[PDB]
């Protein structure tokens, strides 16, 4: 909404331009969340394009 | 060639940087210019070149 | 289109090296030096990047959008 | 009951249902693309 | 060696242009 008007780089132009595995949201079922602490259930490296 | 008139002409089309005349951006980029290449579209931002 | 997720042989994970590899090229290392910095010793990995062609930046310009 | 396509190069809902000659609501374009389904489908990670 | 040619007023004029455009670019 408030990007600069020089409008050079797409990164400022767009929000959610690049999708990254870090965007994943865990969906624990029932006792899964209780069994395991957070983080340990994740995409391992968080950096993948 | 008229060495004086040509010097009176270069000022209209070029400017000296580090002892060498660099062509003026505003003549190198006519007023209807735009990002032409196979990359990001953009307006006539000679600001960056200057 | 986009860079693949892993090396075709061996199998190392590579989908998080194109951004940084281009960033280092944007630091004017030598391409081989960029690979060395990213730790691609096996040449099957080296080829995976050096011979890549990023098209999606070309295509998405043709992408229709309101 | 009403139907919703989208026009080329403006992508505006043209909302066409009659036997009328097809025509964008605002553009002069004469081509339009159906919207993607809402029904969910599946794919296999192999 | 452009200074071998006696027209030192040119550099002052170029500097005036530089100062103007600098005044324009400093607004960033
Ligand atoms: Zn490999
Ligand atoms: Zn239209």
Other CB atoms closer than 10 Å to residue C21's CB: what's the count? Answer: 22
Contact C49, C35 (CB under 8 A): yes
Give, in order, the Cα–Cα distances in Å from E8 to each of A36, B16, C9, E4.
Answer: 78, 12, 67, 10
Breaks in chain A (C–N beyond 2.5 Å) sit after none
The dihedral built from the CA positions of residue B12, B17, B23 and B24, taken in this order, carries a sign that is negative
**Rg of chain B over CA atoms, in angstroms?**
14
- Domain containing C38 equals 1-66
Relative to the alpha carbon of C14, which ligand is closest?
Answer: 1
Give dist(CA D46, CA E8) in Å, integer: 74
Give, in order, the Cα–Cα distances in Å from A18 to each of A10, C1, C15, C18, C53.
Answer: 10, 14, 13, 13, 18
Give dist(CA C54, CA C64) in Å, integer: 20
Relative to the alpha carbon of C9, which ligand is closest?
Answer: 1
User: Among C50, C43, C45, which residue's Cα sits nearest to residue C12?
Assistant: C45
Other CB atoms closer than 10 Å to residue A9's CB: what's the count? Answer: 12
Helical spans, DSSP H, in chain C = 18-25, 31-37, 43-50, 56-59
Q: Which homologous superfamily is D3-46 in? A: RNA polymerase ii, chain L (2.20.28.30)
Contact B50, B28 (CB under 8 A): no
Note the resolution in Å, 1 decimal: 4.1
| CA D36 / ligand 2 centre spacing (Å) | 18
Give, in order, the Cα–Cα distances in Å from D34 to each of B36, C29, C42.
Answer: 32, 48, 48
State the total domains in chain C: 1
User: Are the Cβ atoms of A8 and B43 closer than 8 angstroms?
Assistant: no
Say which CATH number the domain at C63 has: 1.10.10.60
Chain E residues within an 8 Å CB radius of B17:
14
Give the CA count within 13 Å in the CB-facing half-sphere of A13: 9
Delimit the domains of chain D by residue range.
Answer: 3-46
Give, in order, the Cα–Cα distances in Å from A6 to each of B20, B26, B27, B35, C40.
Answer: 30, 18, 21, 12, 38
DSSP conformation letters of B3-40: HHHHHHHHTTTEEEETTEEEEPHHHHS-TT----SSS-
Other CB atoms closer than 10 Å to residue C55's CB: what's the count? Answer: 10
Structure tokens at A44: 């391992």
A48 touching C (Cβ < 8 Å) = yes
Structure tokens at C2: 């986009």
Residue of D nearest to C62 (CA): D9
Contact D5, D13 (CB under 8 A): yes
What SS3 state is found at D22? Answer: coil
User: Among C1, C33, C41, C35, which residue's Cα sits nearest to residue C17?
Assistant: C35
Facing residues of D34 across strands? D5
User: Are the Cβ atoms of A7 and B42 closer than 8 angstroms?
Assistant: yes
Q: Which of B9, B14, B20, B47 to mutate: most E Cβ within 10 Å?
A: B47
Structure tokens at C66: 């309101």
Give, in order, the Cα–Cα distances in Å from C21 to each of A15, D34, E18.
Answer: 23, 40, 37
């Amino acid at each position: 909404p408030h990007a600069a008007k020089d409008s050079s780089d797409p990164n400022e132009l767009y929000v959610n331009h690049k999708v990254y595995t870090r965007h994943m949201t865990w969906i624990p079922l029932g006792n899964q969340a209780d069994l395991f602490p957070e983080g340990t259930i994740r995409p391992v490296h968080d950096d993948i394009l | 060639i008229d060495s004086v008139a040509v010097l009176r002409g270069i000022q209209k089309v070029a400017m000296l940087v580090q002892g060498n005349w660099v062509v003026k951006s505003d003549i190198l980029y006519p007023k209807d210019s735009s990002s032409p290449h196979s990359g990001v579209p953009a307006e006539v931002l000679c600001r960056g070149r200057d | 289109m986009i860079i693949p997720v892993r090396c075709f042989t061996c199998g190392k994970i590579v989908g998080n090296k194109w951004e940084a590899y281009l960033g280092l090229l944007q630091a004017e290392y030598t391409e081989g030096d960029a690979l060395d910095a990213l730790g691609l010793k096996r040449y099957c990995c080296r080829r995976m990047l050096l011979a890549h062609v990023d098209l999606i930046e070309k295509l998405l310009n043709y992408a229709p959008l309101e | 009951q009403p139907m919703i396509y989208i026009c080329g190069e403006c992508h505006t809902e043209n909302e066409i249902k009659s036997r009328d000659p097809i025509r964008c609501r605002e553009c002069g374009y004469r081509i339009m693309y159906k919207k993607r389904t809402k029904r969910l489908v599946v794919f296999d990670a192999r | 060696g452009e200074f071998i040619k006696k027209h030192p007023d040119v550099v002052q004029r170029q500097h005036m242009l530089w100062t103007g455009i600098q005044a324009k670019l400093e607004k960033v």
